[PDB]
Amino acid sequence: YNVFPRTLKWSKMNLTYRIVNYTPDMTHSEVEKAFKKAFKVWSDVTPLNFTRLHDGIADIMISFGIKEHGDFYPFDGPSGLLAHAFPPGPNYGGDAHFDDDETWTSSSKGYNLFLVAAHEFGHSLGLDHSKDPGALMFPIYTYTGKSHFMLPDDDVQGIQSLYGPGDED
Ligand SMILES: Cc1cc(CNC(=O)c2cc(C(=O)NCc3ccc(F)c(C)c3)ncn2)ccc1F
Ligand SMILES: [Ca+2]
Ligand SMILES: [Ca+2]
Ligand SMILES: [Zn+2]
Ligand SMILES: [Zn+2]
Numbered sequence: 001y002n003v004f005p006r007t008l009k010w011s012k013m014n015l016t017y018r019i020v021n022y023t024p025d026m027t028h029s030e031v032e033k034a035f036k037k038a039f040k041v042w043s044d045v046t047p048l049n050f051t052r053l054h055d056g057i058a059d060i061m062i063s064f065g066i067k068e069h070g071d072f073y074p075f076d077g078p079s080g081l082l083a084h085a086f087p088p089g090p091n092y093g094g095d096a097h098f099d100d101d102e103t104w105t106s107s108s109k110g111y112n113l114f115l116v117a118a119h120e121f122g123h124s125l126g127l128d129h130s131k132d133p134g135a136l137m138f139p140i141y142t143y144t145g146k147s148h149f150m151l152p153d154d155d156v157q158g159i160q161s162l163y164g165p166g167d168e169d
Helices: 028-043 113-125 153-163
Strands: 014-019 049-053 060-065 083-085 096-099
Touching (some): 113 153
Parallel strands (some): 060 096
16 A cells, blocks of 8 residues: 655656747747756755656646636736646646746846746746745746856755765765
């Protein structure tokens, strides 16, 4: 027999993702690079592996949409909500949605897609919001301006509480 896991998490280390569509704001290459880097933020500190699918059903379906887009969390035009992701689970579980009424960039202007994506994938993997103002999972977008991204310890401890550290070096 098997009882449901204690925490909401993926029961397999091999996860797949698919970029269903693209925002008008960035080139396909820029978007792909941003998401790849965002997944690496988490795979680097756990035993998780992320493989990209170009079609079909992936564990983490990624899409850009506006207003009503297929769930109970419609976006709201420019400003306000910017994105959200569902926790681990069947069907839409793990999926990540980005409000395409926002401005997405690979710089410090508007919302940095990589940064927001890293945050959303944290949710896709089982992390909720943190009270640490400097955490990636803090609820409010707070671009620091630093030239190098480093996953804050709070996030490292959180993600490893779910999946273990994988290779520690
Ligand atoms: C090269 C480089 C360097 C950096 C430097 N790092 C940061 O600025 C940074 C920001 C955050 C942060 O604001 N967290 C909260 C949050 C984040 C996203 C999101 F959608 C919501 C709703 C809330 N946390 C940790 N570090 C960034 C991008 C980049 F490309
Ligand atoms: Ca919005
Ligand atoms: Ca899914
Ligand atoms: Zn949605
Ligand atoms: Zn969030």
